[PDB]
Ligand binder design. Structure first.
Ligand SMILES: *[C@@H]1O[C@H](CO)[C@@H](O[C@@H]2O[C@H](CO)[C@@H](O)[C@H](O)[C@H]2NC(C)=O)[C@H](O)[C@H]1NC(C)=O
Ligand SMILES: *[C@@H]1O[C@H](CO)[C@@H](O[C@@H]2O[C@H](CO)[C@@H](O)[C@H](O)[C@H]2NC(C)=O)[C@H](O)[C@H]1NC(C)=O
Ligand SMILES: *[C@@H]1O[C@H](CO)[C@@H](O[C@@H]2O[C@H](CO)[C@@H](O)[C@H](O)[C@H]2NC(C)=O)[C@H](O)[C@H]1NC(C)=O
Ligand SMILES: *[C@@H]1O[C@H](CO)[C@@H](O[C@@H]2O[C@H](CO)[C@@H](O)[C@H](O)[C@H]2NC(C)=O)[C@H](O)[C@H]1NC(C)=O
Ligand SMILES: *[C@@H]1O[C@H](CO)[C@@H](O[C@@H]2O[C@H](CO)[C@@H](O)[C@H](O)[C@H]2NC(C)=O)[C@H](O)[C@H]1NC(C)=O
Ligand SMILES: *[C@@H]1O[C@H](CO)[C@@H](O[C@@H]2O[C@H](CO)[C@@H](O)[C@H](O)[C@H]2NC(C)=O)[C@H](O)[C@H]1NC(C)=O
Ligand SMILES: CCCCC/C=C\C/C=C/CCCCCCCC(=O)O
Ligand SMILES: *[C@@H]1O[C@H](CO)[C@@H](O)[C@H](O)[C@H]1NC(C)=O
Ligand SMILES: *[C@@H]1O[C@H](CO)[C@@H](O)[C@H](O)[C@H]1NC(C)=O
Ligand SMILES: *[C@@H]1O[C@H](CO)[C@@H](O)[C@H](O)[C@H]1NC(C)=O
Ligand SMILES: *[C@@H]1O[C@H](CO)[C@@H](O)[C@H](O)[C@H]1NC(C)=O
Ligand SMILES: *[C@@H]1O[C@H](CO)[C@@H](O)[C@H](O)[C@H]1NC(C)=O
Ligand SMILES: *[C@@H]1O[C@H](CO)[C@@H](O)[C@H](O)[C@H]1NC(C)=O
Ligand SMILES: *[C@@H]1O[C@H](CO)[C@@H](O)[C@H](O)[C@H]1NC(C)=O
Ligand SMILES: *[C@@H]1O[C@H](CO)[C@@H](O)[C@H](O)[C@H]1NC(C)=O
Ligand SMILES: *[C@@H]1O[C@H](CO)[C@@H](O)[C@H](O)[C@H]1NC(C)=O
Ligand SMILES: *[C@@H]1O[C@H](CO)[C@@H](O)[C@H](O)[C@H]1NC(C)=O
Ligand SMILES: *[C@@H]1O[C@H](CO)[C@@H](O)[C@H](O)[C@H]1NC(C)=O
Lengths: 442, 418, 196, 49
């Protein structure tokens, strides 16, 4: 990183005079492809004798089907925990009078057949799935034999992919409900009932939550709305530019596809047998020896399945941890406001917006970042009549001739008064106290 | 005997074959067993003969009426499958040896024959046939027309022939191709006599070398060809290669030397029909997944079946019946479609859930996401609570799981010292 | 059920493991005694090495599954410890971490292989529609609430705490002045009482 | 110790892995060279697989 130094001193403080509203994108996996394996078709494809030999392994199989079923269930639980945290479906009002804040690029547009936002459409257009549909009829792979499609080769070997319980439309509807709740009711819909509030005023609260007096927002409301709209436009331009931004989600798709393709390739292995092809053994050897070679192939292919399932269980644990993190963020950033540093983006967190994505969630984190800082000379306290006056909430600064007190995160100098400071003890103990005067209102 | 409420993933859908089809090259010639097994003269083992056998039918049933083999041994393939098989090329290696040397005609063996006159590959596919010839290859005064090599500088390679007759230098001194001390002739012969002991009697050995299931066949078994039926799951046999599948037309331009195609997993993709030089694709019949949706067996014995990757808007289903409808998860049979949404009970997939309602039947429906409502948003209206409730919720978390310990010896080798 | 499943899973794994003893793994028999009682050592040893390999693989599978479940339990236990620390020992501002609502306090209870938290939360029960304004102009000055909102019942303006309706008269000790009324959008006219 | 155990565990795993080379796994010998030096390929290959 770049090397720099900070001008530290015992009587100098840097205070921001301006700020920027930034929007960051955090991408998290939530689910991964649900799989199901028919041990008989994979190991003993269309062979009754092999299946009959295989039946004494019924337990190794049923424990593999249980593990994969458990994974598929946990993928649906993960999705439900991330997106289904609101009991009711909220809808936006017909009038978008949000104080100048433009949400048209994140709220659903009713004119498309699936009520997704434009940014969500971009997300679906950057990550490319493998199945592209959960129906693949026998005639559709019967006539594509000229074509080496991977899905057909999987399905002929007992390897299938189950559809998710929650479709992209249902997830989009949940994210729409979450946006309408956060925008029209702030955090109140998370705790209990959705309590309507003007958007600008909730932003006044969000500013108070980060130590910035609400009058700053109202005075700069036009600037804040313009910075937000520009940040959203920049997010749109970024997602529209490249594709690797969502690599974290694409890798999940790729890993699952790779595992299945790898599994299919393992069928070419002999595992010590004279041939990997069951039919060549059966067509050349009589049962007493075909059975010796075949038990070996059954063992090898069962080990391959065991390896696959183990890898899927480990990845499922990885996805679950990511999904739990995503649910935590949904709860503590979208439904509330986070004081946890860098949990919901860099800066002082204001609010977040969920967007759905294939096998994942994208959070748009709106944060307050100090933009232009200044060097002021400061003091921890001022002596007046021998009394030591301290700020209740803020710091003392001087422009070189006059002492003022101001809010910590935004330069807003105030005259030193008895209603801003408090007295405790006297000036002769505290180190670095300076002399000034404190005005007493009539 | 009890199945809990839910959806279970069961065995895929499976078509059974309807008929078997046997296809072989349209050759009617019989293999020249008489010219091999009944020959006036066999070659010597040092100069063994190699006859090519092609374009014929190998029954070997004819041999039963006259020949009686002392040994028969197939490496590679089983002796009972040979009728159900055909070969890419066949070579018959024919020679006479001493009886005690028959054991040496095998992979992995050593001796004056295995090393000097007839060596087999350790990757040998084929059959070793031997029988005594004490009443043909031996005379009174003995038969000295059968020669073997006794001295060689090194062992042979498999199927190597070394007919040379140069003088073998046993000693340190060159011999300039003359007979003398430490300079022996490498060729020696057998004295086969009708009064000699069994192990010193002549044996006639025929080695049949053949590469199976990998190239065009010309030497086929007595199996009947059948007519060809397309687009049905059948039990096929192409040049000895057996299997189950659907045979369809293909556009794969095989080269004249190619007989079979294969996938990366090494299974057969296509074959060239030996009767009509066309290429047929082999697509396994069984395909797709079947899920079973059921209330517990203490409630009802009615089930619904979801057939994944079939369409229903000659179906590949076990039973149509009534109540058949297409979902994006597959074709669901046995569940009645109800327009009303409910909370999900038995998940089906793709937004579809099922439940057992009331007269009683299984229903399928699109799941509800929660009640739909709207918020009265405006720029100058705020909702503020006037009353509150204290609620208590229960959150349950696992902390530990059962601690286990396994004695590998008792589990694997329970009460067995060995 | 979440706790019962853990018990069931462990029992199932052990029962499954026992059932695997009936498998041949390619051997002529799964029973060591039938091999030993029928075959002499050179062949009993060939079949037995095969059974040893198969049963060792079964144990390897069991242990792998237990390690994965143990990671699952550890993650749950770490979450439980986090809740114990930030809900029972303290008070959580993290939304929906310790139940729905505004968290007040939590109570631990033990359970077999687990912990049960009773989360006591504050939930708003009866809401009302008030007309509001971000600020009020008085003598040209813009007055803002320090902590709360401005509401009106239609004739009088009051200021009240955010989570519970408790209307207060607008005074100089409840609001603060910054700038003036001509910049802030939606400001309304009223009066601010100045205590004597 | 919490950090030392990580180092120890990784070292232990590798050392354990090396020790597994002494196992026969049902073969006549764990040493590839002793099989190859005593058995011809058709049987050395059965033991070696
Ligand atoms: C704080 O920064 C913003 C921009 O970061 C300033 O707004 C810009 O002001 C210049 C000069 O008036 C304009 O030309 C730009 O178009 C403004 N940008 C936007 C987005 O409005 C703002 O004036 C700064 N405030 C202070 C007090 O320095
Ligand atoms: C919000 O921003 C958009 C551009 O990001 C403004 O323009 C609209 O964009 C959408 C989609 O690109 C179009 O369907 C609309 O017709 C556009 N509107 C106009 C007037 O051209 C949009 O106007 C902004 N919203 C507001 C309230 O100004
Ligand atoms: C701040 O003001 C106090 C009071 O005027 C100063 O204290 C005086 O210091 C001088 C010199 O050190 C003494 O002679 C006086 O007797 C002190 N008066 C009292 C009441 O203590 C103090 O020095 C001033 N400090 C600064 C930094 O200006
Ligand atoms: C094949 O022929 C080569 C060449 O004649 C043989 O190798 C020779 O073996 C003699 C043995 O005394 C050596 O003295 C020569 O130096 C070798 N020459 C070379 C080029 O290797 C080889 O042994 C023969 N192989 C067989 C199986 O007979
Ligand atoms: C707030 O709600 C509680 C109950 O949710 C109200 O208490 C009830 O009041 C009625 C009428 O007086 C009684 O009949 C019930 O028995 C009370 N319930 C309990 C649990 O005490 C309370 O009066 C409400 N307060 C306001 C201001 O509306
Ligand atoms: C709030 O009060 C101020 C002051 O009385 C109003 O400002 C006056 O508006 C009228 C008509 O717009 C002008 O003719 C006066 O000159 C304004 N006076 C001052 C001092 O600016 C303001 O319009 C009032 N707003 C509302 C909504 O009642
Ligand atoms: C003359 C060319 C023959 C080529 C045949 C090639 C491959 C098929 C082999 C068929 C059997 C060989 C004869 C042995 C029959 C068994 C006789 C018996 O056990 O009683
Ligand atoms: C504050 O002072 C230091 C050194 O005196 C200087 O490097 C720094 O740039 C100053 N800050 C600003 C905002 O100019
Ligand atoms: C400090 O601020 C006061 C208040 O506006 C001003 O009068 C004074 O000139 C300023 N001094 C400097 C050095 O900026
Ligand atoms: C602050 O630092 C400067 C220089 O290091 C020193 O001269 C001055 O006395 C210090 N003041 C205090 C209050 O520490
Ligand atoms: C072999 O010879 C015997 C007797 O000469 C004869 O009966 C038999 O048919 C012959 N075999 C064949 C295949 O011609
Ligand atoms: C018989 O063989 C010939 C090849 O010479 C082939 O054309 C013909 O189709 C075969 N018979 C049948 C019934 O296929
Ligand atoms: C099944 O239903 C019967 C009622 O006929 C009930 O007694 C039994 O406990 C139930 N068992 C399960 C596992 O649901
Ligand atoms: C096949 O199913 C799809 C839905 O998966 C449907 O749109 C299509 O129309 C169906 N095919 C026919 C011929 O109706
Ligand atoms: C469901 O609604 C469709 C149209 O909305 C109608 O055609 C169909 O008959 C209805 N079915 C039932 C069972 O009400
Ligand atoms: C607030 O007003 C809206 C529409 O004006 C109404 O639907 C809602 O019920 C009102 N709130 C209450 C608590 O009555
Ligand atoms: C608003 O509250 C005040 C204070 O009690 C009361 O005098 C006035 O009548 C109320 N107005 C309405 C419309 O409720
Ligand atoms: C509030 O909204 C109403 C209707 O949309 C409008 O007439 C009024 O002028 C708006 N007021 C402000 C301050 O935006």
């Amino acid at each position: 990183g770049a090397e720099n130094s900070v001008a530290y001193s015992n009587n100098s403080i840097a205070i921001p005079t301006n700020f920027t509203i930034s929007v960051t994108t955090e991408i998290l996996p939530v689910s991964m492809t649900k799989t199901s394996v028919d041990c008989t078709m994979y190991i003993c494809g269309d062979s009754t004798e092999c299946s009959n030999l295989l039946l004494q392994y019924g337990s190794f199989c049923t424990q593999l089907n249980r593990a994969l079923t458990g994974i598929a269930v946990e993928q649906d639980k993960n999705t439900q925990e991330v997106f289904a945290q609101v009991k009711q479906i909220y809808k936006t009002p017909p009038i978008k009078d949000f104080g100048g804040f433009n949400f048209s690029q994140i709220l659903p547009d009713p004119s498309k057949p699936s009520k997704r936002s434009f940014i969500e459409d971009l997300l679906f257009n950057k990550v490319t799935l493998a199945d592209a549909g959960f129906i693949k009829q026998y005639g559709d792979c019967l006539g594509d034999i000229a074509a080496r499609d991977l899905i057909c080769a999987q399905k002929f070997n007992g390897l299938t992919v189950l559809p998710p319980l929650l479709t992209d439309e249902m997830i989009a509807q949940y994210t729409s409900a979450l946006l309408a709740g956060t925008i029209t009711s702030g955090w109140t819909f998370g705790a209990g009932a959705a309590l309507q509030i003007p958007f600008a005023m909730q932003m006044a609260y969000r500013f108070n939550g980060i130590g910035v007096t609400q009058n700053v927002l109202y005075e700069n409301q036009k600037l804040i709305a313009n910075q937000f709209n520009s940040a959203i436009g920049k997010i749109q331009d970024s997602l529209s530019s490249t594709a690797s931004a969502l690599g974290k989600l694409q890798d999940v798709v790729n890993q699952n596809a790779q595992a299945l393709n790898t599994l299919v390739k393992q069928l070419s292995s002999n595992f010590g047998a004279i041939s990997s092809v069951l039919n060549d053994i059966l067509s050349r050897l009589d049962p007493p020896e075909a059975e010796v070679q075949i038990d070996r192939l059954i063992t090898g292919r069962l080990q391959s399945l065991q390896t696959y399932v183990t890898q899927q269980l480990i990845r499922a644990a990885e996805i679950r941890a990511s999904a739990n993190l995503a649910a935590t963020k949904m709860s503590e950033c979208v439904l509330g406001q986070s004081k946890r540093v860098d949990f919901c983006g860099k800066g002082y967190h204001l609010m977040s917006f969920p967007q759905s994505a294939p096998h994942g969630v994208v959070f748009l984190h709106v944060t307050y970042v100090p933009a232009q800082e200044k060097n002021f000379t400061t003091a921890p306290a001022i002596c007046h009549d021998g009394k030591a006056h301290f700020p209740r909430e803020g710091v003392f600064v001087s422009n070189g001739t006059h002492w003022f007190v101001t809010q910590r995160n935004f330069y807003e100098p105030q005259i030193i008064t008895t209603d801003n400071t408090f007295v405790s003890g006297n000036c002769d103990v505290v180190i670095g106290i300076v002399n000034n005067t404190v005005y007493d209102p009539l | 005997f009890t199945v809990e409420k839910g959806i279970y993933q069961t065995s895929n859908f499976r078509v059974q074959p309807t008929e078997s089809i046997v296809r072989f090259p349209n050759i009617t010639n019989l293999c020249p067993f008489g010219e091999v097994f009944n020959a006036t003269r066999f070659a010597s083992v040092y100069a063994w003969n190699r006859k090519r056998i092609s374009n014929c039918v190998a029954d070997y049933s004819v041999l039963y009426n006259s020949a009686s083999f002392s040994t028969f041994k197939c490496y590679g393939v089983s002796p009972t499958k040979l009728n159900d098989l055909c070969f890419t090329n066949v070579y018959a290696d024919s020679f006479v040896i001493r009886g005690d040397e028959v054991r040496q005609i095998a992979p992995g063996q050593t001796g004056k024959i295995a090393d000097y006159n007839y060596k087999l590959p350790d990757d040998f596919t084929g059959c070793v046939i031997a029988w005594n010839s004490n009443n043909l290859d031996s005379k009174v005064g003995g038969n000295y027309n059968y020669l073997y090599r006794l001295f060689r500088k090194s062992n042979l390679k498999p199927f190597e022939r070394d007919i040379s007759t140069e003088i073998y230098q046993a000693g340190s001194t060159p011999c300039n191709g003359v007979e003398g001390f430490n300079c022996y002739f490498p060729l020696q012969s057998y004295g086969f006599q009708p009064t000699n002991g069994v192990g010193y009697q002549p044996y006639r050995v025929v080695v049949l070398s053949f590469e199976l299931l990998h190239a065009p066949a010309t030497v086929c078994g007595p199996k009947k060809s059948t007519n060809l039926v397309k687009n049905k799951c059948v039990n096929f046999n192409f040049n000895g290669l057996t299997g189950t599948g659907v045979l369809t037309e293909s556009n794969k331009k095989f080269l004249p030397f190619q007989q079979f195609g294969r996938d990366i997993a090494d299974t057969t993709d296509a074959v060239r029909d030996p009767q009509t030089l066309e290429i047929l694709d082999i697509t396994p019949c069984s395909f797709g997944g079947v899920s079973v949706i059921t209330p517990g067996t203490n409630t009802s014995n009615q089930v619904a079946v979801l057939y994944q990757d079939v369409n229903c808007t000659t179906w590949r289903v076990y039973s149509t019946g009534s109540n058949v409808f297409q979902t994006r998860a597959g074709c669901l049979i046995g569940a009645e479609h109800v327009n009303n949404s409910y909370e999900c009970d038995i998940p089906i997939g793709a937004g579809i859930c099922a439940s057992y309602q009331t007269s009683q039947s299984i229903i399928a429906y699109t799941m509800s996401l929660g009640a739909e409502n709207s918020v009265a948003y405006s720029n100058n209206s705020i909702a503020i609570p006037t009353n509150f409730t204290i609620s208590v919720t229960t959150e349950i978390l696992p902390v530990s799981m059962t601690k286990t310990s396994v004695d590998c010896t008792m589990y694997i080798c329970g009460d067995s010292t060995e």
